Design an enzyme around this catalytic site. Structure first.
Site, PDB file in Angstrom:
ATOM      1  N   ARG A  54     -90.233 -19.806  47.219  1.00 44.85           N
ATOM      2  CA  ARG A  54     -90.678 -19.024  46.091  1.00 44.85           C
ATOM      3  C   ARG A  54     -91.949 -18.273  46.358  1.00 44.85           C
ATOM      4  NH1 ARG A  54     -90.943 -19.988  39.869  1.00 44.85           N
ATOM      5  NH2 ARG A  54     -89.163 -21.375  40.359  1.00 44.85           N
TER       6      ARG A  54
ATOM      7  N   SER B 180     -98.197 -26.100  39.693  1.00 45.77           N
ATOM      8  CA  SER B 180     -98.295 -26.751  38.400  1.00 45.77           C
ATOM      9  C   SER B 180     -99.220 -27.986  38.525  1.00 45.77           C
ATOM     10  CB  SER B 180     -96.898 -27.102  38.024  1.00 45.77           C
ATOM     11  OG  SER B 180     -96.689 -27.155  36.631  1.00 45.77           O
TER      12      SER B 180
ATOM     13  N   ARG C   3     -85.201 -20.021  42.665  1.00 51.71           N
ATOM     14  CA  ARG C   3     -84.855 -21.363  42.280  1.00 51.71           C
ATOM     15  C   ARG C   3     -83.709 -21.799  43.191  1.00 51.71           C
ATOM     16  NH1 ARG C   3     -83.683 -23.842  36.375  1.00 51.71           N
ATOM     17  NH2 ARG C   3     -81.690 -22.844  36.715  1.00 51.71           N
TER      18      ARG C   3
ATOM     19  N   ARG D 136     -83.654 -30.317  44.522  1.00 55.57           N
ATOM     20  CA  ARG D 136     -83.500 -30.290  43.082  1.00 55.57           C
ATOM     21  C   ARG D 136     -82.103 -29.880  42.667  1.00 55.57           C
ATOM     22  NH1 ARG D 136     -89.895 -29.964  42.412  1.00 55.57           N
ATOM     23  NH2 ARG D 136     -89.667 -29.199  40.351  1.00 55.57           N
TER      24      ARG D 136
ATOM     25  N   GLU E 178     -94.397 -18.722  37.881  1.00 55.40           N
ATOM     26  CA  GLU E 178     -94.994 -19.984  38.278  1.00 55.40           C
ATOM     27  C   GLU E 178     -94.981 -20.262  39.775  1.00 55.40           C
ATOM     28  OE1 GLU E 178     -93.311 -23.583  36.531  1.00 55.40           O
ATOM     29  OE2 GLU E 178     -94.070 -24.497  38.366  1.00 55.40           O
TER      30      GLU E 178
HETATM   31  N1  SSA Z   1     -85.792 -25.173  42.726  1.00 49.28           N
HETATM   32  C1  SSA Z   1     -86.912 -24.641  43.151  1.00 49.28           C
HETATM   33  N2  SSA Z   1     -86.859 -23.655  44.050  1.00 49.28           N
HETATM   34  C2  SSA Z   1     -87.990 -23.159  44.547  1.00 49.28           C
HETATM   35  N3  SSA Z   1     -89.239 -23.533  44.313  1.00 49.28           N
HETATM   36  C3  SSA Z   1     -89.257 -24.469  43.313  1.00 49.28           C
HETATM   37  C4  SSA Z   1     -88.176 -25.057  42.712  1.00 49.28           C
HETATM   38  N4  SSA Z   1     -88.587 -25.952  41.728  1.00 49.28           N
HETATM   39  C5  SSA Z   1     -89.884 -25.962  41.847  1.00 49.28           C
HETATM   40  N5  SSA Z   1     -90.381 -25.070  42.772  1.00 49.28           N
HETATM   41  C6  SSA Z   1     -91.770 -24.884  43.288  1.00 49.28           C
HETATM   42  O1  SSA Z   1     -92.537 -26.113  43.361  1.00 49.28           O
HETATM   43  C7  SSA Z   1     -93.702 -25.968  42.516  1.00 49.28           C
HETATM   44  C8  SSA Z   1     -94.156 -27.184  41.690  1.00 49.28           C
HETATM   45  O2  SSA Z   1     -93.017 -27.759  41.008  1.00 49.28           O
HETATM   46  S1  SSA Z   1     -93.260 -28.521  39.677  1.00 49.28           S
HETATM   47  O3  SSA Z   1     -92.098 -29.184  39.157  1.00 49.28           O
HETATM   48  O4  SSA Z   1     -93.763 -27.546  38.763  1.00 49.28           O
HETATM   49  N6  SSA Z   1     -94.440 -29.601  39.836  1.00 49.28           N
HETATM   50  C9  SSA Z   1     -94.451 -30.553  40.723  1.00 49.28           C
HETATM   51  O5  SSA Z   1     -93.503 -30.898  41.430  1.00 49.28           O
HETATM   52  C10 SSA Z   1     -95.814 -31.174  40.845  1.00 49.28           C
HETATM   53  N7  SSA Z   1     -95.555 -32.312  41.687  1.00 49.28           N
HETATM   54  C11 SSA Z   1     -96.767 -30.187  41.507  1.00 49.28           C
HETATM   55  O6  SSA Z   1     -96.275 -29.673  42.760  1.00 49.28           O
HETATM   56  C12 SSA Z   1     -93.300 -24.866  41.546  1.00 49.28           C
HETATM   57  O7  SSA Z   1     -94.520 -24.336  41.042  1.00 49.28           O
HETATM   58  C13 SSA Z   1     -92.573 -23.889  42.438  1.00 49.28           C
HETATM   59  O8  SSA Z   1     -93.530 -23.238  43.280  1.00 49.28           O
END
Ligand code: SSA
Ligand code: SSA
Lengths: 421, 421
Positions: free
Chosen positions: B386, B348, B271, B256, B345
């Site tokens: 996380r 999701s 993050r 990301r 969180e």
């Molecule tokens: N940059 C990041 N760093 C660490 N963990 C992250 C990051 N972005 C998201 N997450 C993790 O990935 C999970 C789901 O991300 S989400 O965008 O909310 N949702 C999805 O991608 C959906 N596909 C469900 O997984 C988050 O709840 C968190 O646990």
């Protein structure tokens, strides 16, 4: 990176390295360009001194004579801008060329390309099948263990595994990492991107730049091996003698562009864009006796993973034109793939002496308080999915199921891989 | 992608939904451009019909009348050419507009942004400590469980875990794959790059394009979630009714850009640009009662994993302006992080009815033999690193060591994580 002082004092040793490794470099032009840079820095130090001399005179200069001194000052300052300028573009071309100078290979390295590679040892053999054996792709097809729709999502040289073979991929990686931890290497889970400096440090840039995927609009690049991250953790740090050897077992996702591999292993699990690899990296003191003791345990560590995996393998001494610019020595471990009637590599073990330490600035305080460049080494511990090609084909059962080696049964919960249906 | 027939049979609901979801869409102009494209289509069919007859009749037309029909056919000729350029331009502006139309939120979703999100319930109590709890960066610093040098190699928002915490990361990922395979979902290990077409299929493009890293000099992008690959697998197939619901548990590295407020609570494991995630994905039949049964399954699953991980959590109903353009429903699961005095969180859960099925073209043959768009859902199973931030703070012991939940002791081989040094 090579010591410019041994380059200057013994360019013949380096010319044989360039010759026998096939590096496209003209050492005489490097040494001439180096002389030119050293000339320009003398004459630029001279104009810089002369400029300061005239400048010093100006506070003591009466008007008819300070008019002369600014005329002299401005011309001195102008030759200083030309010398600064020509120097900056010649030092930059020198930097570039020095980054291409190869390490001399060890005296027993085969000379020539891949065809001079020499089998050193063979342990175990091709299995004797009572039935007609399937290749790994027909075993995947038959049992529903991979997903060919991945090809339309992600393109070619991609794989996605399913059911018990998805789980076996993860079990093998945790197994490699646990085996490395009980052998004394420190387990690390790492990122798969890094800035340019880390690529330069290992020698992947400039020579293998085309093999690396850049992440667009960043200064980051996807790493082809966790060796790029593990070797850059300690740039600019001077390690204490007592920390040595540093031994790291690092896991990271790996991305290879596979530029130039036209129609080479386009088939199953052998040559993909992204795979998982647990890497063995050793940083040790600057003695051949410590490099050779570390090379031997790196190799025994991978021979031991293969014996626990119950796979037939051979070691191969790698030839000068095939080991790469920075290697002193390289030994590949190759496993027998039945469907191809041949050995295919699963591991490359390299000793690079201080060629990467000089690039990445890895140094330690030796037992006499002297500061030195360390010696580095690395070997694959286990990379998936490619060993899954040899495990499927060597461990297939008559019904098309596959058995899991005894050491992997605790990691899988089962003794046989089952069709996904 | 919404159904254009329902868009213009029910514009009031899409207007409400564009307002409640904060989407920057002028529905009135979209609907007008749509009337234009549809009227140009009818008109170019009426001139093509008439054009055809004029052309056929002019070889038989008597002099005065051969001239009137030639002139009319010439007039219909220019008109058709003008209707073709207008349709082509207008249609392209309309496809770009349809890609931004949001799905209606389910009626019980709070209206408003993030602020309006409602806690549904909380399970488990906050930990009681006999000592002042350290936060997870302090526990990692004290025990030597991460590697701060990674920031020089890779930049900010990188993490490198070491020793028992590296191994705990691999163990959590294997446990979530085994939990999911025990709950009937099919295990897959997946790539992390995909073509553009797969991002448009989930809705990540166009709306979240800045959140996605692209691989330069290629037509590929790194996936922020396995949902982009899992949703694109069956594009263009017509699934037999009996394969439904398809339950996929897919694992892949997720990348990301995080170019959405850098500086938001980042230091530590919360993050990062690259993490590991196991994903629950469900493709079911186009029935609200099938979507609702799949949604309750996905949530019970993550709840059961958090129960097994012995973590206090709460469920949060997400508001209309916080769920995103494609969601029907969205429930976040948040775990208590003691050092922030709040829940953050971890998971999701989304129900997107057929908004993704229409962009990715996912269809099945319903039990009456009619071909329908299917409904898709997805929920995190476990994402690292996380979850390690909450697990270290909640399970810390007085000496700065962290115990392992009973369900992970088999994956870990030990009841407590130990310092590396
Ligand atoms: N940059 C990041 N760093 C660490 N963990 C992250 C990051 N972005 C998201 N997450 C993790 O990935 C999970 C789901 O991300 S989400 O965008 O909310 N949702 C999805 O991608 C959906 N596909 C469900 O997984 C988050 O709840 C968190 O646990
Ligand atoms: N594209 C590929 N697909 C699958 N596995 C590959 C691919 N390229 C390399 N590997 C695996 O990774 C191993 C090491 O790659 S290597 O270039 O030869 N060596 C290194 O990167 C060194 N760090 C030693 O690990 C190979 O033995 C092979 O098992």
């Amino acid at each position: 990176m090579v010591d410019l002082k041994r380059l200057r004092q013994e360019p013949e040793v380096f010319h044989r390295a360039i010759r026998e490794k096939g590096v496209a470099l003209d050492l005489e032009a490097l040494l001439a360009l180096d002389r030119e840079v050293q000339e320009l820095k003398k004459r630029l130090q001279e104009v810089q001194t002369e400029r300061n001399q005239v400048a010093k005179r100006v506070p003591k200069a009466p008007p008819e004579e300070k008019e002369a001194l600014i005329a002299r000052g401005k011309a001195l300052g102008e030759e200083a801008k030309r010398l600064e300028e020509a120097l900056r573009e010649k030092e930059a071309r020198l930097e570039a060329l020095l980054l291409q100078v190869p390490l001399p290979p060890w005296p027993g390295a085969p000379v020539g390309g891949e065809e001079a590679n020499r089998e050193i040892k063979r342990v175990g053999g091709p299995p004797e099948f009572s039935f007609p054996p399937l290749d790994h792709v027909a075993l995947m097809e038959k049992n529903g263990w991979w997903e060919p729709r991945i090809s339309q999502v992600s393109g070619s040289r991609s794989y996605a595994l399913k059911g018990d073979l998805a789980l076996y991929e993860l079990a093998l990686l945790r197994f490699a990492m646990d085996f490395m931890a009980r052998r004394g290497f420190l387990p690390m889970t790492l990122p798969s991107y890094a800035r340019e400096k880390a690529f330069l440090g290992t020698g992947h840039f400039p020579a293998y730049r085309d093999q690396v995927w850049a992440i667009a609009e960043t200064d980051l690049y996807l790493t082809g091996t966790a060796e790029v991250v593990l070797n850059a953790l300690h740039s600019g740090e001077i390690l204490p003698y007592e920390a040595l050897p540093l031994r790291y077992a690092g896991y990271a996702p790996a991305f290879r562009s596979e530029a130039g591999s036209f129609g080479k292993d386009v088939r199953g699990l052998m040559r993909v864009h992204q795979f998982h690899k647990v890497e063995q990296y050793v940083l040790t003191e600057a003695s051949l006796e410590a490099s050779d003791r570390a090379f031997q345990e790196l190799l025994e560590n991978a021979e031991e993973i293969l014996r626990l995996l119950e796979l037939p393998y051979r070691l191969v001494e790698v030839a000068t034109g095939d080991m790469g610019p920075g290697k002193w020595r390289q030994v590949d471990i190759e496993v027998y793939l039945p469907s191809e009637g041949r050995y295919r590599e699963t591991h490359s073990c390299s000793a690079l002496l201080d060629w990467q330490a000089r690039r990445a600035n890895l140094r330690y305080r030796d037992p006499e308080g002297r500061v030195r460049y360390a010696y580095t080494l690395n070997n694959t511990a286990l990379a998936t999915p490619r060993i899954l090609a040899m495990l499927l084909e060597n461990h297939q059962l008559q019904d098309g199921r596959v058995r899991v080696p005894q050491a992997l049964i605790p990691y899988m919960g089962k003794e046989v891989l089952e069709p996904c249906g």
